[PDB]
Design a protein around this ligand. Structure first.
Ligand SMILES: Nc1ncnc2c1ncn2[C@@H]1O[C@H](CSCC[C@H](N)C(=O)O)[C@@H](O)[C@H]1O
Length: 265
């Protein structure tokens, strides 16, 4: 097929949007968690109330509850940030260890020290650029890296780089995985994904907690099916939410409770 993909058309229409229109559209009909108590928790220094460190936790929870991924054994979390995913994985029955890597530093999130349930099996290391980290054995591989750009070409290249690095870690045998695809609608990214699906399996899913201001999808081990179809479906939904007559806003949802306490190691 010649011409632009649907996702590229979405991207173009998104780039043309004015400030006010962008912030209404961003959350139109999306799923959102109420982070109010988690923000007050952060500022009180409450590490034992079960409040997630970020909105990421809820996204991994959406996926795990639908069995799109089932964390087990040694979990590696690439781009762990504050630890939203690392700490949620540590709450999972058959997870034994969680190792998170993240760059940190100015402008970026440092891992937060929490006492959510299983906190004692989490080890997050800041100051790590994963593109230069030699792969290690894992049973579960998580990766939540992807910096946005108005250019789909710049996003395409970013995504491919992630896919190349992710393929390394996947070749070390993890059968459970969950990987953010920044820009899944560009032809080269599709080509690579389709190849990766042949070798490692899985499928691409859109998480409804994602904002309409991005087209991020997760390549997850528990999913299957035609990648092109899944992607186009998302483009169509995101486009269908554009140019709304009246903005109804997001559907709110309760945040995840991660509890507290250590677990047997
Ligand atoms: N090359 C790189 N190496 C390590 N971390 C990176 C990186 N590029 C971006 N990052 C980090 O990856 C993080 C992705 S957002 C992390 C969200 C996390 N899953 C959660 O639930 O909290 C950002 O904090 C960013 O600092």
């Amino acid at each position: 097929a010649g011409g632009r993909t649907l996702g590229e058309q979405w991207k173009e229409k998104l780039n043309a949007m004015g400030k006010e229109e962008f912030f209404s559209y961003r959350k139109e009909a999306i799923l959102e968690v109420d982070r109010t108590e988690a923000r007050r928790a952060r500022r009180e220094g409450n590490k034992v109330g079960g409040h997630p460190v970020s909105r990421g936790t809820a996204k991994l929870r959406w996926l795990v509850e639908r069995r799109f991924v089932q964390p087990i054994g040694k979990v590696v979390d690439l781009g762990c940030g504050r630890g939203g995913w690392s700490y949620y994985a540590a709450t999972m029955k058959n997870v034994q260890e969680v190792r998170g890597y993240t760059k940190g530093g100015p402008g970026h999130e440092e891992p937060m020290l929490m006492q959510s349930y299983g906190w004692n099996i989490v080890t997050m290391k800041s100051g790590v650029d994963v593109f230069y980290k030699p792969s290690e054995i894992s049973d579960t591989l998580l990766c939540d890296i992807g910096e946005s750009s108005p250019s789909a070409e710049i996003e395409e290249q970013r995504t491919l780089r992630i896919l190349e690095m992710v393929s390394d870690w996947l070749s070390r045998g993890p059968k459970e995985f969950c990987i953010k695809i920044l820009c899944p609608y560009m032809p080269k990214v599709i080509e690579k994904l389709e190849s990766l699906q042949r070798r490692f399996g899985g499928g691409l899913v859109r998480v409804p907690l994602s904002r309409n201001s991005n087209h991020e999808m997760y390549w997850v081990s528990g999913a299957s099916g035609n990648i092109v179809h899944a992607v186009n479906m998302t483009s169509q939904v995101l486009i269908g939410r554009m140019d709304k007559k009246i903005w109804k806003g997001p559907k709110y949802e309760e945040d995840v409770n991660l509890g507290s306490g250590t677990r047997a190691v």
